[PDB]
Write a protein that binds this ligand. Structure first.
Ligand SMILES: N[C@H]1[C@@H](O[C@H]2[C@H](O)[C@@H](O)[C@H](N)C[C@@H]2N)O[C@H](CO)[C@@H](O)[C@@H]1O
Ligand SMILES: C[C@H]1O[C@@H](n2cnc3c(N)ncnc32)[C@H](O)[C@@H]1O
Ligand code: MET
Ligand code: SF4
Length: 453
């Protein structure tokens, strides 16, 4: 049945600097954001609903424009992020006041925030990642369905053990329902790029701070390679210029990765792609396979440039010399790189932060081959609860931008972390410039790390 359905990534005061897909689907906000990705989750929902829906459309109001109004009676699904949960609850109440049977889609696993969605937003339910596979039943009324949160049984312990349905029978995302031209991925193409998943979840212990296992579960759940190949053929046929994999650890299964590479090569879709993965799930053979299969580059997590931080707080048992050797193998194979760094994990000191910057300049990374995040305690992670029990969070959640200093540790004050927060803007500007700016930035960081005012 279903009737008219409109899936909307609502408008916010953040603009397109808000990228709802990142940080485990809770959203990042990065000033002058040039990684503008399409509303993948809404497209997957459209893909599963499209069979039993009279009409269905997708509206990224930051691109297509704000939906003027809705006709009363139709379903509206909004994408609620974390740093804009209030604005998206307001948009959800706006659709409710026009007789829309409102729903909400989010990766937020915090019954406290769901409360705000049923109260201000007035949602007949809240949809979570697990719900996508069953998104039909959810709107048919069934509530024993995973990923669907009523305001009734708002504290069922099923919503912290994400039961994932049969991923292999999921329809392809309705990528044909969205003009991909306004979507950008600078390291590959400036127009018409799309996002894609080949697997979900992550089992690693750095779930202490990272939200990806919280949003997606601690179990790797893969799609069949032949579905991903079908997606690449779909992208070529639609005229999409690039495909960006959102898998937290794309190369987790090594043999599966080589098989997927060979299959993508055989398909000869001529679609270039990008992926995210751990350094310790990459070796020379797998890198060669990726470059050969059409992968332009990878985002890998280094987090810190301080050896002791690697042996403790980073929780990856990642060695800095392994990072160096991987840098050599990746440049020597022509794979583009973006190293992912993190400032302000508990146990971090000034000299630790400075040694991170020291590592970034030692490696000689262009401005485009690194990204620095400021530690933000995402609700549902162990770090957020330890941060509450220690009065660590000084900022409000509408600044839970992955780049705003919003919490201090037992070793660092928000003045130190806000200072570093601005030092990352300095590092980008200074990496755009020449050696003379990088030596005077490296002087400042040394002086700031020593003194300890
Ligand atoms: N792909 C990872 C990476 O995402 C970043 C990306 O590296 C950066 O180049 C963009 N300008 C902003 C974008 N949020 O870093 C983010 C954290 O800052 C992670 O949440 C995300 O999964
Ligand atoms: C998924 C990527 O995002 C970064 N990352 C992981 N957890 C956090 C957090 N709590 N706050 C800010 N950035 C984080 C890491 O660098 C990782 O590589
Ligand atoms: C990025 C990747 N998930 C890592 O942790 O290194
Ligand atoms: S492996 Fe990557 S995505 Fe997974 S928890 Fe660790 S940092 Fe986060």
């Amino acid at each position: 049945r279903l009737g008219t359905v409109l899936l909307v990534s609502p408008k916010t005061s953040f603009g397109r600097d808000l990228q709802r897909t990142y940080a485990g689907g809770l959203g990042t906000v990065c000033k002058d954001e040039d990684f503008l990705l399409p509303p993948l989750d809404l497209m997957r929902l459209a893909g599963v609903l499209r069979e039993d829906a009279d009409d269905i459309a997708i509206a990224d109001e930051e691109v297509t424009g704000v939906v003027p109004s809705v006709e009363p009676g139709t379903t509206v699904i909004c994408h609620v992020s974390l740093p804009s949960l209030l604005e998206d609850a307001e948009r959800l109440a706006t659709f409710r006041a026009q007789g829309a049977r409102c729903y909400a889609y989010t990766s937020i696993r915090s019954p406290a925030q769901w409360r705000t969605l049923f109260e201000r937003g007035g949602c007949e339910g809240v949809l979570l990642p697990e719900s996508i596979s069953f998104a039909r039943a959810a709107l048919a009324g069934d509530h024993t369905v995973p990923g669907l949160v009523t305001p009734d049984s708002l504290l069922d312990p099923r919503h912290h053990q994400p039961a994932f349905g049969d991923l292999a029978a999921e329809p392809l995302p309705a990528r044909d329902l969205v003009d991909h031209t306004p979507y950008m991925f600078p390291p590959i193409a400036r127009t018409g790029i799309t996002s894609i998943n080949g697997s979900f979840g992550c089992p690693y212990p750095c779930r202490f701070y990272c939200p990806y296992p919280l949003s997606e579960g601690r179990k790797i759940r893969t799609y069949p390679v032949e579905r991903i190949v079908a997606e690449f053929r779909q992208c070529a046929e639609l005229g999409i210029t690039a495909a960006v994999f959102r898998d937290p650890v794309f190369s987790f299964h090594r043999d599966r990765t080589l098989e997927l590479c060979q299959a993508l090569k055989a398909a000869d879709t001529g679609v270039p792609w990008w992926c995210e993965t751990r350094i310790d799930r990459l070796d020379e053979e797998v890198v060669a396979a990726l470059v050969d299969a059409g992968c332009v580059g990878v985002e890998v997590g280094v987090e810190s440039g301080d050896p002791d931080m690697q042996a403790t707080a980073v929780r990856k048992r990642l060695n800095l010399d392994t990072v160096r050797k991987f840098h050599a193998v990746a440049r020597k194979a022509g794979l583009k790189l973006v190293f992912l760094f993190l400032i302000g994990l508990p146990r971090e000191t000034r000299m630790s932060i400075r040694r991170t910057f020291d590592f970034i300049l030692e490696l000689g990374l262009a401005d485009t081959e690194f990204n620095l995040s400021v530690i933000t305690p995402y609700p549902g992670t162990e770090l957020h609860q330890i941060a509450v029990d220690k009065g660590w969070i000084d900022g409000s959640q509408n600044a839970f931008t992955s780049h705003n200093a919003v919490m201090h540790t037992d070793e660092l004050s928000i003045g130190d972390l806000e200072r570093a927060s601005r030092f990352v803007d300095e590092l980008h500007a200074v990496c755009k410039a020449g050696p003379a700016e990088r030596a005077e930035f490296q002087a400042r960081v040394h002086a700031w790390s020593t003194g300890d005012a």
